[PDB]
């Protein structure tokens, strides 16, 4: 499968902004092929970890919490 797929990784050892920007980097890589006429499938494995990374990302930037302390 690795002659037609790209893998974007954002590990747990990587800081919270790299888990925050991982789906946007994946869908930018998808948009490059989409606006050329190709067909892209993008799989975001565990978006709830993106939500917790952005929750950390906001709470450390002194943004006010909301429900379950998400922004």
């Amino acid at each position: 499968a690795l002659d037609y797929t790209i893998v974007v990784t954002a590990s747990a050892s990587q800081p919270a902004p790299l888990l925050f920007l991982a789906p946007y980097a994946g869908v930018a890589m998808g948009e490059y092929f989409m606006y050329k006429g190709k067909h892209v499938l993008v799989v975001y494995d565990d978006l709830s970890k993106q939500a917790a990374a952005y929750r950390e990302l906001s709470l450390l930037l002194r943004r006010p919490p909301g429900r379950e302390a998400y922004p």
Binding site: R63, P64, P65, G66, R67, P71
Partner: protein, 470 residues
């Protein structure tokens, strides 16, 4: 006159003006910026003023993304809120939140009449003293959950239930029999479904009656906040000048509240009960008290609602159930039976169905139809498990009349002519009351359980049954 940017934190933008020249609340502020070098990005924003702070600064809300903003860009004060084009110009067009056409049909010229978005609700003496009934031509709606001319309706449906087909036949029947323009205001719901709905507007041919406003999930919560209000100020032109009985479709008023909850935490407000903004009920009321029937006009409103996790005690469905007058509940099982529109006859309710409003005969016929369909609902497991040949008589009669009733509630729409071929029907309320009275009395128990499927009137039942069989 001229103000510069101080803070950019996500959606919100703080702008400092010169002393004595502050803009009032809800004005539109514009940023037209051209990049002076290769280290900058061209910017076209519209900023809605939300708060006044102390030292000549103003906290605004962005209508688009704030990516690219530099602390120190000059901001143009327009001196008015977001002026939105109104008229017969807007019919058949698709708009932004700012009143700009997002379709490629053309630009609206600058000398056209533009109305501001924010205006007070109509007063106490300007409203209509009596309750009048918005006659739709749809038999589930006309019989079992009538629509107030000027009231607020709830559609509770997902996909596969033909919600777009029901929306289209509402627009078609109102613009056919009442001469009423409709307006679809899609507030933060699924750009794919918005495009499906626009191409079905184009195919149905009823689009030339509606005006469409889309601010979807992709847009910042200022745009999702103000889309319902710009669709509302497009409908209020037709009410306030043409006197018409205007429809107004808001797709998920829930999004009107949660976009405000996204905004208000950034505005600096203390959080409320469910994490929702403190100003939940007054913002929802300033939306849904402009949707009223005045003396010369009307705006009725059919409003889709996605209750999150089907939890009706959440503060935003509570605050918007405080304003509803009816519910139209689309079910998937009735769509699998073939019953179009798939309105659940027992769960869909209305404030109208009381004998002082709809009349006395209509009230007895609707309550007897509800009682026999409830009794057939109570026999669902018995028929499905134990069998049909074992119940009793005076209950086999109940399910016998209940099948003919729950198929006669379906219609052939004018919109489905391009898909089925039969030319559709508009059914008055007195004729469907007479038809359901005749089916309840037992006049049509010798006809089959087909020929009640997809017919308008009650004589079309026998005109179809003589074509099939006896």
């Amino acid at each position: 006159t001229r103000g510069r940017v101080i803070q950019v934190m996500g959606p919100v933008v703080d702008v400092k003006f010169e002393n004595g020249h502050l803009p009032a609340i809800y004005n539109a502020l514009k940023i037209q910026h051209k990049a002076r070098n290769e280290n900058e990005v061209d910017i076209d924003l519209t900023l809605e003023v939300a708060l006044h702070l102390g030292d000549d600064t103003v906290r605004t809300i962005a209508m688009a993304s704030t990516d690219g903003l530099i602390r120190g860009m000059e901001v143009i004060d327009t001196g008015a809120p977001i002026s939105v084009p109104v008229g017969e110009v807007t019919l058949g067009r698709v708009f932004n939140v700012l009143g700009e056409p997002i379709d490629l049909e053309g630009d609206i010229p600058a000398d056209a009449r533009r109305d501001p978005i924010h205006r007070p609700a109509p007063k106490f003496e300007e409203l209509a003293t009596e309750v009048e009934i918005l006659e739709t031509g749809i038999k589930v709606v006309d019989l079992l959950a009538p629509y107030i001319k000027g009231g607020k309706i709830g559609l509770f449906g997902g996909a596969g239930v033909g919600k777009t087909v029901l929306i289209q036949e509402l627009i078609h029947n109102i613009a056919q029999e009442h001469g009423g323009i409709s307006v679809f205001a899609g507030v933060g719901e699924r750009t794919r479904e918005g495009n499906d709905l626009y191409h079905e507007m184009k195919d149905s041919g009823v689009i030339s009656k509606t005006a469409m406003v889309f601010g979807q999930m992709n847009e910042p919560p200022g745009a999702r906040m103000r889309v319902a209000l710009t669709g509302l100020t497009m409908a209020e032109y037709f009410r306030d000048e043409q006197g018409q009985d205007v429809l107004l479709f808001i797709d998920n008023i829930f999004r009107f509240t949660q976009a405000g909850s996204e905004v208000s935490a950034l505005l600096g407000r203390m959080p409320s009960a469910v994490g929702y903004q403190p100003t939940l009920a007054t913002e929802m009321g300033q939306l849904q008290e402009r949707i009223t029937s005045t003396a010369k006009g009307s705006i009725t409103s059919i409003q889709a609602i996605y209750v999150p996790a089907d939890d009706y005690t959440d503060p935003a469905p509570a605050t918007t159930f405080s304003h509803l007058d009816a519910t139209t509940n689309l079910e998937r099982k009735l769509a699998e039976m073939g019953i179009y529109p798939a309105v659940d006859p027992l769960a869909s309710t209305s404030r109208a169905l009381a004998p002082e409003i709809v009349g006395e005969e209509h009230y007895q016929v609707a309550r007897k139809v509800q009682q026999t369909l409830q009794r057939y609902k109570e026999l669902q497991d018995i028929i499905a498990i134990l069998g049909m040949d074992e119940l009793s008589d005076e209950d086999k009669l109940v399910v016998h009349r209940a099948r003919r009733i729950q198929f006669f509630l379906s219609q052939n729409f004018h919109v489905a002519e391009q898909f089925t071929g039969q030319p559709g029907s508009y059914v008055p309320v007195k004729e469907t009351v007479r038809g359901f009275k005749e089916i309840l009395e037992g006049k049509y128990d010798h006809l089959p359980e087909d020929a009640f499927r997809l017919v308008g009137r009650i004589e079309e039942v026998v005109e179809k049954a003589k074509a099939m069989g006896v």
